[model samples]
Target: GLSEQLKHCNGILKELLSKKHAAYAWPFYKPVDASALGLHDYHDIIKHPMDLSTVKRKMENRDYRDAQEFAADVRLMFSNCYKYNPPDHDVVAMARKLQDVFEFRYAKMPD
Candidate 1:
């Protein structure tokens, strides 16, 4: 059952990274380079940093007990973006768009 759930979660992640969402997905593909970006207080602000690559690795390694747990990390990624960026910033807008897509698909997942 866990394996099946993992497969389903993977499918959702794949869709999030697909071509249609490329613009919103690029910045989230890997961990943010806070230091290079001169975001001196980024780490202090966002306690739990997450990224698509990390989520994939966690899923592959069976770190998530279920889809809900996996979804939490995905939400955290966007939430972190919201917390660190200005509300009107382009990255925040992108995060909002992608987050909505994620919530829609997540709501459709089978219980």
Candidate 2:
């Protein structure tokens, strides 16, 4: 049962990372580069930095106890994006779009 759930969770992630959402997904694939991006206060602003790569690794390591935990990280990734960038920022727009897609699919996830 756990294996099935994990498989489904991974499937959701795979779809998000696919070509269909590549434009919105690229910015969230890896951890944000605070120094390079000059976001010196990013660590102070975002208490928990999340990214797709980290989510994938967490899944592989079985860090999540359930699908909800997995979903939380995914949502955290976007929320962090929202928090770090202005409302009108392009990355925020991307996060909004991807988050919408994620919620739609997440609603249909198996219980």
Candidate 3:
């Protein structure tokens, strides 16, 4: 049940941001350096990523009955981010699914 809720949140966030799974998905209960995360744009852009503190502060005043509820609130935060700084509106719908322009399925990650 917890996993499902997390999945739902992850799914919504992924789609809303139009990002690949690994590039955008957040595992529950982990803190990340969001500013360093790469995001896509039409002009080969990747910068000014989201902030975890923002999410924490936004959720700070909310009452959530379950993990899903918590996820929902976080989703709203993500929604706002994308709204203010949306990438190319002409973005190919399927392009969001690619991990990168190289389309590396099992792209070796850096240490």
Candidate 4:
């Protein structure tokens, strides 16, 4: 049932996350000659160190079919948030980055 019509969507995503080339113009890390699944690019403005493999695993491990599921997931992470100051991480920024990546990879771009 699941393998009826879906073929290409997963392949492109897998390729995008697996392809790695020497880092040309890294922003933060020193001139290390490798990239984390080519997620970071010198040519593009939006970039992050997000590991897609880990992202995939994390996503599959969660059940976010509805808003409540999402709320629960976030609530668990932030339940004790008041105890510690905000880290250098930004969830909004991370979400934005993923949005851009998804749009670029999956969306139909206009001419």
Candidate 1, 33-75: lDDT as tens digits: 9999999999999999999999988987889998879999999
How do all the candidates rank in terms of TM-score, highest first? 2, 1, 3, 4
Residue-wise C-alpha lDDT for candidate 3, range 1-111, written one tens digit per residue: 425444443334334344344344432123333445443341233233333344344344433344545544454434434454446532222234322422231122121
Candidate 4 residue-wise lDDT, 43-95, digit = tens: 25322223334334444554334333333433332322212224444533433
Give stretches of model 2 more than 4 Å off. Answer: none
RMSD of 4: 12.5
- Which regions in candidate 1 have their CA more than 4 angstroms from the true location? none
Candidate numbers, best lDDT first, in rank order: 2, 1, 3, 4
| TM-score of decoy 4 | 0.28
Estimate the TM-score of every prediction.
Answer: 0.93, 0.94, 0.28, 0.28
Report clash pairs, candidate 3: none
Q: Which residue pairs clash within candidate 2?
A: none
* lDDT: the better of candidates 3 and 4: 3
* lDDT, model 3: 0.37
Identify the candidate with maximal TM-score.
Answer: 2
Off by over 4 Å in 4: 1-5, 15-89, 108-111
lDDT value, residue 102 of candidate 4: 46
